[PDB]
């Protein structure tokens with residue numbers, strides 16, 4: 001009976017060791033998932049960290065968090081374009097005294113036969129101003145030559 | 151023959167359990183390396 | 199680039215799309231009474 | 247392992263003992279295609295992986311953000327481009 005019980009003890013102890021090892025691995029995974037969830041709470045819900053696809057794929061606007069069984073559920077809200085327009089744009093202009101200007105989060109477009117600015121994620125021509133322009137004392141080559149701007 | 155085969159089974163099953171534990175550890179390392187690589191793609195390649 | 203200008207498709211209308219994501223931060227706290235699992239209440243097993 | 251070859255390859259020994267490596271669900275050729283698409287996504291319009299601007303402009307604006315005046319950047323554009331492709335070559339030649 002002692003040798004039979006010893007065989008059972010050895011089998012049961014090996015099974016418990018295997019379960020403990022698998023539990024350690026799973027709990028490491030849970031710890032790192034929870035670290036990721038805390039990062040998402042800090043950087044998607046409570047603030048919007050300047051990281052592109054951290055808080056869900058796409059043009060992330062904002063995120064919210066709700067309680068879930070054994071975890072958190074995050075609601076990632078994104079800016080989804082619906083319809084598009086093909087428009088000729090310029091990534092920079094050489095204006096006035098050879099001063100270079102680049103569009104700030106947008107593009108330079110020709111609307112009504114004169115240079116205007118439009119945002120990159122929504123077609124809406126705007127007057128060119130220092131609010132939407134990065135200034136350069138010397139214009140980059142291949143910038144569209146626009147001596148009549150400003 | 152049954153007790154000898156039992157000794158072989160036990161040795162092989164223990165070696166298999168050790169290999170599967172090492173494989174779980176290595177695959178955890180691979181998962182977190184791939185998460186780092188995804189982070190690097192998103193925040194170094196597709197943006198800065 | 200034709201005349202210094204490139205062809206780009208800029209959105210003219212948009213919506214807001216929701217995307218839920220579940221991140222597991224917890225797991226059931228499994229506790230095992232090792233002596234009761236292995237030996238139940240049998241004194242000869244507890245001695246071994 | 248069954249092609250009539252003379253080489254007793256260890257992978258044929260492993261596989262006939264039950265230890266076999268299965269191919270990934272996506273071939274490395276498909277991953278290579280994905281990486282190449284992600285690469286040309288930065289060098290041509292609409293520059294979907296280069297912040298929506300030409301690659302050279304992105305490089306110039308990135309160097310400018312480190313504290314480098316734009317004057318030398320748009321003056322030494324060709325030197326910067328040559329330095330970039332020389333760095334890429336040195337990365338390539340580092341594998342030998």
Ligand SMILES: *[C@@H]1O[C@H](CO)[C@@H](O)[C@H](O)[C@H]1NC(C)=O
Pocket residue numbers: 082210211212
């Ligand atoms: C944008 O799309 C929505 C739904 O497709 C529509 O109701 C709305 O009129 C559209 N607006 C414009 C300016 O196209």
